[PDB]
Design a protein around this nucleic acid. Sequence first.
RNA 1: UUACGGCGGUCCAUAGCGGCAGGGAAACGCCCGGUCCCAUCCCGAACCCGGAAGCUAAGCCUGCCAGCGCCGAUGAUACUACCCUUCCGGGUGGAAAAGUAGGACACCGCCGAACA
RNA 2: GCGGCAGGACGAAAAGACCCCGGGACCUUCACUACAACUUGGUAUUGGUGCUCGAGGGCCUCUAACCUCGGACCGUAAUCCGGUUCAGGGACAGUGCCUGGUGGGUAGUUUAACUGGGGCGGUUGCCUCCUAAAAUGUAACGGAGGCGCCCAAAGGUUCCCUCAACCUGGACGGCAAUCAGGUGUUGAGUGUAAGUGCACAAGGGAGCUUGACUGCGAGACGGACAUGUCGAGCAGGGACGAAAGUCGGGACUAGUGAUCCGGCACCUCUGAGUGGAAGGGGUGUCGCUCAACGGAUAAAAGGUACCCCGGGGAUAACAGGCUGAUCUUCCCCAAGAGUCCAUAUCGACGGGAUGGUUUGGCACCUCGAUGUCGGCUCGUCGCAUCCUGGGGCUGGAGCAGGUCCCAAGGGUUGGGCUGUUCGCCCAUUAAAGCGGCACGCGAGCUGGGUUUAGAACGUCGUGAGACAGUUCGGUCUCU
RNA 3: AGACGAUGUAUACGGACUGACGCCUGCCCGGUGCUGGAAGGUUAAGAGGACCCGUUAACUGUGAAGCGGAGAAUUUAAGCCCCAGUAAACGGCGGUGGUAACUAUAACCAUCCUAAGGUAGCGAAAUUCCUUGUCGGGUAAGUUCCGACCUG
RNA 4: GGGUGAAAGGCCAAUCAAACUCCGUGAUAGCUGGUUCUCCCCGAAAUGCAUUUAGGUGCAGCGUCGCAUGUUUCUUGCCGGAGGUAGAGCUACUGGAUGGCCACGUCAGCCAAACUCCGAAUGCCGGUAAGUCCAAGAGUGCGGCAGUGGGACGGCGGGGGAUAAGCUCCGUGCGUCGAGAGGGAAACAGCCCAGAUCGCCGGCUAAGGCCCCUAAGCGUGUGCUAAGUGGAAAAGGAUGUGCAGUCGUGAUUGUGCGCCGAUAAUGUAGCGGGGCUCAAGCACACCGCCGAAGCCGCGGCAGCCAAUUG
RNA 5: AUGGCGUGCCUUUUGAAGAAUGAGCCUGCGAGUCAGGGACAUGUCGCGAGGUUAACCCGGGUGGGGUAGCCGCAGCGAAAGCGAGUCUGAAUAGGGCGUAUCCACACAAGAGUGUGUGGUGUAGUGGUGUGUUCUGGACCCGAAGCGGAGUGAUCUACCCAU
RNA 6: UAUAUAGGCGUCUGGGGGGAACGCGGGGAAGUGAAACAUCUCAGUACCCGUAGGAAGAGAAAACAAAAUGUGAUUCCGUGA
Lengths: 76, 44
Amino acid sequence: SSSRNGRDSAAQRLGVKRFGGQVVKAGEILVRQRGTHFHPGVNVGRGGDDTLFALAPGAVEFGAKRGRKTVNIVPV
Amino acid sequence: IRPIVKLRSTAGYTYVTRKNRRNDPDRIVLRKYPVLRRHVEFRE
RNA sequence: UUACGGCGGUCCAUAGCGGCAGGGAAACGCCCGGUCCCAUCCCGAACCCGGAAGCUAAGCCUGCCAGCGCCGAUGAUACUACCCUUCCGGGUGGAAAAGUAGGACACCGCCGAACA
RNA sequence: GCGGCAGGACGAAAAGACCCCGGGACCUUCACUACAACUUGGUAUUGGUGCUCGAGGGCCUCUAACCUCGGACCGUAAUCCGGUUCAGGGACAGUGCCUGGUGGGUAGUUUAACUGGGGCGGUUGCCUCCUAAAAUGUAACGGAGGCGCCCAAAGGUUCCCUCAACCUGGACGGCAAUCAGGUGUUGAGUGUAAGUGCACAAGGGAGCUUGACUGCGAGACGGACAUGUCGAGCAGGGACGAAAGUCGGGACUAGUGAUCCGGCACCUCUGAGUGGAAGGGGUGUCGCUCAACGGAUAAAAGGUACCCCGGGGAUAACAGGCUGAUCUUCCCCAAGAGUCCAUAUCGACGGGAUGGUUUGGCACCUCGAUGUCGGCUCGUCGCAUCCUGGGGCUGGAGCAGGUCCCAAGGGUUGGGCUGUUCGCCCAUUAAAGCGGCACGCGAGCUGGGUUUAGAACGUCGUGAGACAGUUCGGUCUCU
RNA sequence: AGACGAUGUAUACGGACUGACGCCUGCCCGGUGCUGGAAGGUUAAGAGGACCCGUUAACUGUGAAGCGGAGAAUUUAAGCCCCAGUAAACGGCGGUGGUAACUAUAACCAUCCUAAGGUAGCGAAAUUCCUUGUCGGGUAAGUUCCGACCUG
RNA sequence: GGGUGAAAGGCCAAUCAAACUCCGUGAUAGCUGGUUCUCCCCGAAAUGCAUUUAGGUGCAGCGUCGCAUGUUUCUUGCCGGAGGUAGAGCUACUGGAUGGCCACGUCAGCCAAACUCCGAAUGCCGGUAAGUCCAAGAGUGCGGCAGUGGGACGGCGGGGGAUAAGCUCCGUGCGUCGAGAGGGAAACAGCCCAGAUCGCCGGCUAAGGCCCCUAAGCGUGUGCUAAGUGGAAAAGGAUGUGCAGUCGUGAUUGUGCGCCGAUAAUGUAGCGGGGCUCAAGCACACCGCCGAAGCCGCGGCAGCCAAUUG
RNA sequence: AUGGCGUGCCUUUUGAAGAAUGAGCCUGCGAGUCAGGGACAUGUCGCGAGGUUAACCCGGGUGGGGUAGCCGCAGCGAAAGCGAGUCUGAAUAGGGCGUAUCCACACAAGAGUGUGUGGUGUAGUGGUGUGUUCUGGACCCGAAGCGGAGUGAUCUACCCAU
RNA sequence: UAUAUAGGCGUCUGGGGGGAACGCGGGGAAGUGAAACAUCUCAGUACCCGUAGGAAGAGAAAACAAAAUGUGAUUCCGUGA
Ligand SMILES: [Mg+2]
Ligand SMILES: [Mg+2]
Ligand SMILES: [Mg+2]
Ligand SMILES: [Mg+2]
Ligand SMILES: [Mg+2]
Ligand SMILES: [Mg+2]
Ligand SMILES: [Mg+2]
Ligand SMILES: [Mg+2]
Ligand SMILES: [Mg+2]
Ligand SMILES: [Mg+2]
Ligand SMILES: [Mg+2]
Ligand SMILES: [Mg+2]
Ligand SMILES: [Mg+2]
Ligand SMILES: [Mg+2]
Ligand SMILES: [Mg+2]
Ligand SMILES: [Mg+2]
Ligand SMILES: [Mg+2]
Ligand SMILES: [Mg+2]
Ligand SMILES: [Mg+2]
Ligand SMILES: [Mg+2]
Ligand SMILES: [Mg+2]
Ligand SMILES: [Mg+2]
Ligand SMILES: [Mg+2]
Ligand SMILES: [Mg+2]
Ligand SMILES: [Mg+2]
Ligand SMILES: [Mg+2]
Ligand SMILES: [Mg+2]
Ligand SMILES: [Mg+2]
Ligand SMILES: [Mg+2]
Ligand SMILES: [Mg+2]
Ligand SMILES: [Mg+2]
Ligand SMILES: [Mg+2]
Ligand SMILES: [Mg+2]
Ligand SMILES: [Mg+2]
Ligand SMILES: [Mg+2]
Ligand SMILES: [Mg+2]
Ligand SMILES: [Mg+2]
Ligand SMILES: [Mg+2]
Ligand SMILES: [Mg+2]
Ligand SMILES: [Mg+2]
Ligand SMILES: [Mg+2]
Ligand SMILES: [Mg+2]
Ligand SMILES: [Mg+2]
Ligand SMILES: [Mg+2]
Ligand SMILES: [Mg+2]
Ligand SMILES: [Mg+2]
Ligand SMILES: [Mg+2]
Ligand SMILES: [Mg+2]
Ligand SMILES: [Mg+2]
Ligand SMILES: [Mg+2]
Ligand SMILES: [Mg+2]
Ligand SMILES: [Mg+2]
Ligand SMILES: [Mg+2]
Ligand SMILES: [Mg+2]
Ligand SMILES: [Mg+2]
């Protein structure tokens, strides 16, 4: 005679899908992130979901700018 | 209540959208774009 | 080249915020007015346009200050992967946070300014 | 080997009847869906005049259809059945077809799962945090909260702006209205939970607008699958902006429902001889608390102690097993009360263990059977000793006690009431001890209790029926 | 068809409950039934068929005649709606809050509620959970028994 | 689905909440049982998701066979990454919270799954250099045939319970059993050691052992223990005793063994028995040997691979 | 004589010597089958851009005919349709599904390699073996019960005549 | 009761029952499958009733087909599938 709780939502895989030096195609997705933890640098867009994705092909960085954490592709 | 209103052309019901009976009476005329190929005014 | 004015770069304070004294050559400034282009939920305050009377008193700039804030080892310890241990405990690698020694009043890059 | 006794071989007998699971069967009703039966009208059988309400209905009368289980007569030397004929009724009844209603009187069925056994309770899909152990993912009837929307701007784009709190000075006006001016770097604010973000603003203002578009989409994320999720970029034709540019709804993630079959508009796609149409098909979109939310049907509740069959120790009741919260016997520390004096005797608050004897937790053995409380018969062991026996201390004069240590040899009565165990009482006694052994012992016994079928009472139920509520009756197998 | 009922006829026959005899059998017509009444409301078949739609002689896209698809209004009957009767029909029968001249109790009275609030009689009962109620009798000792009380 | 019934669901040919017999019919059962010859090679799962579903089943996961591809797989060292747990910290926020000084403020000492200025180790993802390489009998794609979808206990990190359970539900390129015999633990699926092709009256070892049962030490050296401690247990109580500290005796602190507390029911019965202190006990040293189906030796079979032999 | 070591078999289970199930014993019988131009994989054999016949008729027979048909050979699309293309679309815009495949050359340069000229030139189908599968009782045994047509009152329930 | 019937009387011919399967006509289940269950399936099957004949039914277009196009009663088999 208890438990008013005992519900949960589906997990939604939500994590950095591309780490470090990886070769990543032009439209290829990376860090899904709810609420833009990471911000878009030079060759990454940001979707309406706050999902980041590559614009150009190249190699993923993870640097920073002005205190913010930045993802960006540099070319090969 | 938020009912389901179809938008019709002056010439020529491509679309339908939610608007309400209380806040927006005299149901809406806006504008919007296939048969003609221009943005023609559409009324409720 | 010298206390000049812009526009930047740094896994953005060792660049900050204060304190005390200096700066005005061109320039940045406040300033001087509201006709002209353009403005205020009201006001030429601001946003604009038109000028150069009066000054560095402020911004901006350059000094010297550990005053707050920041940065921060080395060496220990906690924790820990793996191993060995009959409870307890230790063995070979990783290794903080905290506090301490001290750092620090930034450091660079190409475009002008008047003097070359 | 023979005679005996029955403690065990979880003895023999009966694929447990209890319990749950899924198949059946009867029963019940305001479950569902038919049907019988009963009644209602239309219309055939079914006709003739009359009088009227009418925008074909209501009725009158008549006899000829049709009826009589009214009589007489004949076939016929019989209360059947025909035929004839008087007397009645009469286009009504009955009967066919069509059709509304009533309808457990019958018939076929349905009546969910999870679940520390089942029932009652709670829950069922989606979003958010923690459990979750620094990628992702992750259980429980673990711990917290939300959603089934709202907004024609709370969307798009171009500009500009910085909050809350706090101190100081002001008519009404105060620790809250507005007014200035200071400190103030994120506390405030974000349509909506929480988290992640956001001061460069995604927060606060204003001007114009409708991209809350049409045809598309390289490439990845995520997944059993079905879903779902992001998307640069190209074109048409537009919005804002001087431009570069951004715009395919909203800071982000909840706000939804697959298929099937229908509804509407649109398109020259087809059109069963041909030319048209009907119907089909396409593009666009509408109808599901299908919420038990991957939806078994368009359409569905209960009882069974009258039960039946198939299974299970995958799962309960009895006993064993582990555990020991709760019970039980000791113990640590003494605040104290005992005239004074903690420890003669009691000992609060708090702490630590023993025992497995109570109520429990768990589900490990047995459901192709481990058969049942109390009593009788027969016992056997332990000591935490009721009596007898031996000791220390005493707030022990003596008698009689108290308390603690030692000790298991023997002994521990008969009746009253209750099925009782326990308990209250009675008269005694040196004393009327406490426990274990399937709460010892039914192939040793009884059958009062519990727990089958009968039946009445109170209660709950529309009802069948139900109740660790009472009541009376109720097969005890084996060489 | 016919049969029993019955070779009976309301002092008879069928059904429902109750159960010799004695004294009795209170209140409720809201619900559900059953009985009657029908003035209106709603409605099925069958009649009726305006207005539409398909085709084509005629008119060059415009439409009447034939044929046939869709079929609205207007018409009714019983039922249900509605109004009454009926409880020896199935059933149903209340709540709290105050008050007496010592205490206690509440004749009484206030206020809600319903269709109406349980009357007579009985009561710890085949009915009473707490329960071995309390009190008396019976017994050396009565969880049963008998007689009372009423907190049914 | 009818009869009869002074009514119990009674009785209707020993059977009745719907008789019996034959035929539909070899009814159906997600249920229980049974399925018969041999050797060889390989070898699972007891999880995820969905379910009028939970003891059934569909697809994925894990097995096998055949055809592709030919090291990609796995391992270790480097390197480039994101993380918010352990720990810690809090005038760094959000709560809870102790004591001073004057509610606040200041001065200290704190606590936290749903607190974070901070912040590991491990694991994870990629790139790279070798290793393994007559082998893992790998990895990935496609197909034929599967079974499984009741797991259990141990180690470590958790939830629920009382931080109870041989409890229950999870995580872990965690193990074993399931499906693994052998040796050790007296006996003893899950613990330690180790993977059984067959034969041998051959050696060397593992865990664990060496007085006798019982194969091998009454082994050696320096100490401790008097309680059969060893061969069960607590909060506590106490001039038992050995060493190392600290102001001939008293206090004091550490530390090795030991004493009491200690106490359930058939019979010693809490060393596996005997027996052990003349240590067969305990601690650290030190030589040996015993001990497996492991390893080696000699010999015989078979499978895959590359040159009958390896 | 004696010594060491050693807890039946099967089923079903997390786990069985189990005190869980099943069998007293022996001999004989008793469970994966067969039909179909069936379906998909896969051997093997005939013929190959073709392969093969079904009813049926002539035969002493298993051997001759028999081209109707089915499969391959062109697709894409809702369809009309057009066809190495085609469909959605305003589109020499992309994308979907096809053009047997593997080669060189050309261009493009690229966002993961595309488009073309040129060569090469495909492999199905009908028997039969095995695996599994569809429809049939489909590996074998076992309910309680459901429906149809009959058989029962010599037992028992009740009534009728005597 | 009379035109006559109903009946009565005398006479000739036929029918009545049985059978294994096949035939045609009419009535017509359920278990089962749908992993429940009503539509649907099982199935026009089991079973029942009538009535045959060596065979029986059907049968001589109020039929198909789609025009540059025709075939020519019915039944049965293969294929369309
Ligand atoms: Mg004997
Ligand atoms: Mg037995
Ligand atoms: Mg059974
Ligand atoms: Mg029924
Ligand atoms: Mg259940
Ligand atoms: Mg439960
Ligand atoms: Mg992890
Ligand atoms: Mg994670
Ligand atoms: Mg104020
Ligand atoms: Mg036509
Ligand atoms: Mg579901
Ligand atoms: Mg379902
Ligand atoms: Mg049974
Ligand atoms: Mg038990
Ligand atoms: Mg037992
Ligand atoms: Mg069990
Ligand atoms: Mg047995
Ligand atoms: Mg004693
Ligand atoms: Mg007993
Ligand atoms: Mg007995
Ligand atoms: Mg016995
Ligand atoms: Mg009895
Ligand atoms: Mg009642
Ligand atoms: Mg009797
Ligand atoms: Mg009575
Ligand atoms: Mg017309
Ligand atoms: Mg009964
Ligand atoms: Mg009988
Ligand atoms: Mg029946
Ligand atoms: Mg192997
Ligand atoms: Mg499978
Ligand atoms: Mg911590
Ligand atoms: Mg399952
Ligand atoms: Mg499972
Ligand atoms: Mg598990
Ligand atoms: Mg584990
Ligand atoms: Mg654990
Ligand atoms: Mg367990
Ligand atoms: Mg020896
Ligand atoms: Mg010696
Ligand atoms: Mg020795
Ligand atoms: Mg001992
Ligand atoms: Mg003793
Ligand atoms: Mg040796
Ligand atoms: Mg078991
Ligand atoms: Mg198994
Ligand atoms: Mg056995
Ligand atoms: Mg035995
Ligand atoms: Mg048994
Ligand atoms: Mg036998
Ligand atoms: Mg047996
Ligand atoms: Mg039968
Ligand atoms: Mg008789
Ligand atoms: Mg079925
Ligand atoms: Mg079934």
